[PDB]
């Protein structure tokens, strides 16, 4: 295909850090950009520095009071904000750092600009790895996410696309995006997530939607340790059925790195190729598509995966050897562009997964 590939990255995104022990480090995007740069792929992208979002742009989804608190919260004056902190859940789970508002504005501007470029036709493929915050829902900070830039990007895309598809591959369910579009019928949210005594707590097989959004939400409850083959065998038929019976004008893909093996908080058994497989298979359909980088806590694995997915979107395959990036020491033993899956057991069973696909297809029967 060799689709035109846009790429958004702010050089300052790597200068904002969470708490010392926090599992979120935006610097993962920084070695991802370094890996894409040193592979000689910048000759294959148009690289953009998207304008950061303004208050009114993120007020399209979030409340004005929430935005105002976000724009004024600071680790030095947090004791002046006690009611707001507990009301908006901006406490321990989602803390406050120096560049919180700046980082949120940068991510929102990147997502908005990617959606705008898709709408205008400047490209068929745009990449923004500073997004992926799919947990915050319009009034609160959840899952280390403060602004649901995916919702804003979907809003911008819907201006020119009647139907938009959202796909979540993170082990965490896309609570914020699904909630934002739980009643509308113009947005498909499909989350492949680990369901159980897990952080999202939601995303069960019987959350297809309410009102006009009935049978318009797809949830994939998954057991621990799912490997590349099982994940592909579950992902591909469902995506094909959604493409067949819903026909979105655009698709948005959240490339969360939590599913990767060796993840700090993840529990799946997905490797490098097993994680890039879904991206390549989705790109193989031919509609305008989005990439947002969500989960992922091992910066080396997620950065390598992001670089490989960027290569795959350009119809090229990157080599296993590394181009000697700046942060070379992070890659440890052999410095190869791969992720090793571990040997732990897989609990997913063909009967349970077959039941899941049967229920999902029965729900999807009334989407065309």
């Amino acid at each position: 295909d060799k689709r035109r590939v846009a790429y958004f990255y702010d050089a300052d995104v790597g200068n904002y850090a969470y708490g010392a022990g926090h599992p979120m480090k935006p610097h993962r995007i920084r070695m991802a950009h370094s890996l894409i740069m040193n592979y000689g792929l910048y000759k294959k992208m148009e690289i953009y520095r998207a304008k950061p979002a303004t208050k009114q742009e993120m007020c399209q989804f979030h409340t004005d009071e929430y935005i105002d608190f976000l724009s004024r919260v600071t680790p030095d004056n947090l004791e002046m904000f006690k009611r707001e902190s507990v009301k908006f859940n901006v406490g321990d789970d989602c803390p406050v750092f120096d560049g919180l508002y700046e980082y949120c504005s940068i991510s929102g501007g990147g997502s908005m600009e990617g959606a705008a470029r898709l709408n205008r036709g400047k490209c068929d493929v745009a990449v923004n790895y500073a997004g992926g915050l799919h947990h915050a829902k319009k009034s609160e900070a959840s899952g280390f996410c403060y602004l649901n830039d995916i919702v804003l990007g979907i809003i911008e895309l819907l201006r020119y696309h009647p139907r938009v598809l959202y796909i979540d591959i993170d082990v965490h369910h896309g609570d914020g995006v699904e909630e934002a579009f739980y009643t509308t019928d113009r947005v498909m949210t499909c989350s492949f997530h680990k369901y159980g005594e897990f952080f999202p707590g939601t995303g069960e097989l019987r959350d297809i939607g309410v009102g006009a959004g009935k049978n318009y939400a797809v949830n994939v409850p998954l057991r621990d340790g799912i490997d590349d083959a099982t994940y592909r065998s579950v992902f591909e038929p469902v995506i094909k059925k959604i493409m067949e019976w819903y026909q979105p004008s655009a698709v948005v893909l959240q490339c969360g790195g939590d599913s990767l093996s060796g993840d700090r908080l993840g529990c799946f058994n997905l490797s490098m190729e097993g994680h890039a497989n879904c991206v390549n298979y989705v790109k193989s359909f031919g509609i305008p598509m989005m990439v947002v980088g969500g989960g992922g806590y091992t910066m080396r694995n997620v950065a390598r995966t992001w670089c490989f997915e960027t290569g795959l979107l350009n119809n090229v395959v990157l080599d296993k050897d590394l181009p000697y990036n700046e942060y070379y020491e992070y890659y440890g033993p052999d410095y190869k562009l791969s992720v090793r899956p571990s040997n732990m057991f897989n609990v997913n069973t063909p009967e349970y997964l077959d039941k899941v696909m049967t229920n999902i297809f029965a729900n999807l029967e009334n989407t065309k």
């Binding site: 010392a20 690289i47 304008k51 911008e156 369901y195 159980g196």
Partner: protein, 316 residues
């Protein structure tokens, strides 16, 4: 020149010393560069919208921010106050409890009765029975409502939680022992699959997880009924072979009678046993919470009569 800069790091070091030689001995054995982006980052702004005194509250008895009194060591929450006080709108003054202010201002041990009788004769014109209570409530601190220890005890299946919340009877690698009875040694046979599916140590993949339902102890396979994981933090898992006990009739709501202590639990048996227009409160073998005895054999006639009626009404 500042020497206090080198305070601490995640390495446990001032970030300026080195590998911390003890750590050395513990942890040892014995296509251009990125400086081209700034000249190629084309700032894109083609957005469509670009043109735009204790540790517990004295009322709720819980933990949180407190506004304690200097004279009364009784910490109070802000919502647990009458009226609630906004923390931003601080009173900024001498604050005392309702009991504290009553005991510190109107503390007239000799003439308290004079005020009591004054209020009593003031309310005597209209409400004499409630005058004493109307006086006394002003002498008490704000409190959180609680049931008076006997509304709760008439239902044995009700217990009070930690912070006063309501609680009921629904509060709660390769492991082959999960398929064993652990009491009789017999394998646990799932109700649906009619198998234990123990698998093997050599091939753990052949094993199918089982739950042993909490209520009726019927073992069920995690793959027989669709369920991603077990139940270990939530409520007691209930098998799908139990009565609904709550029906949303097409809207209208039906509920099963709550359990009552046997001393007050009355029983009665109908003398008809042909057809009874009674609720789901039946027993298989103050007159508001009676438990009817359904006389199981009568159910065979009743269900059959109902389905036959549905058959003939739909026939025409």
């Amino acid at each position: 020149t500042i020497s206090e800069d080198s305070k601490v790091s995640v390495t446990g070091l001032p970030l300026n010393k080195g590998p911390s030689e003890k750590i050395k001995r513990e942890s040892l054995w014995n296509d251009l560069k990125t400086f081209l982006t700034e000249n190629m980052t084309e700032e894109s702004n083609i957005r469509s919208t670009i043109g735009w005194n204790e540790d517990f509250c004295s009322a709720c008895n819980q933990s949180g921010s407190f506004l304690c009194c200097d004279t009364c060591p009784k910490s109070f929450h802000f919502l647990c106050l009458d009226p609630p006080i906004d923390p931003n709108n601080l009173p900024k003054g001498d604050w005392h409890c309702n009991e504290c202010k009553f005991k510190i201002f109107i503390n007239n041990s000799m003439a308290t009765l004079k005020k009591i009788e004054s209020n009593f004769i003031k309310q005597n014109n209209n409400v004499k029975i409630f005058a004493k209570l109307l006086f006394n409530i002003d002498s008490h601190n704000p409190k959180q409502f609680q049931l008076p220890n006997y509304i709760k005890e008439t239902f044995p299946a009700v217990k009070t939680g930690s912070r006063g919340q309501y609680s009921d009877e629904n509060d709660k690698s390769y492991n082959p022992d999960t398929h064993i009875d652990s009491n009789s040694g017999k394998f646990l046979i799932c109700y649906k699959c009619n198998q234990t599916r123990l698998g093997s140590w050599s091939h753990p993949e052949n094993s199918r997880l089982i739950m042993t339902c909490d209520y009726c102890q019927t073992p069920w396979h995690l793959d027989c009924v669709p369920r991603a994981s077990f139940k270990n933090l939530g409520s007691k898992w209930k098998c799908p072979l139990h009565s609904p006990t709550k029906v949303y009739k097409k809207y209208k709501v039906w509920k099963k009678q709550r359990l009552i202590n046997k001393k007050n639990q009355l029983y009665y048996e109908p003398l008809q046993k042909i057809g009874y227009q009674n609720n789901g409160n039946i027993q298989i073998i103050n007159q508001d919470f009676k438990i009817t005895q359904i006389d199981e054999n009568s159910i065979k006639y009743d269900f059959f009569d109902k389905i036959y009626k549905s058959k003939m009404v739909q026939k025409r």
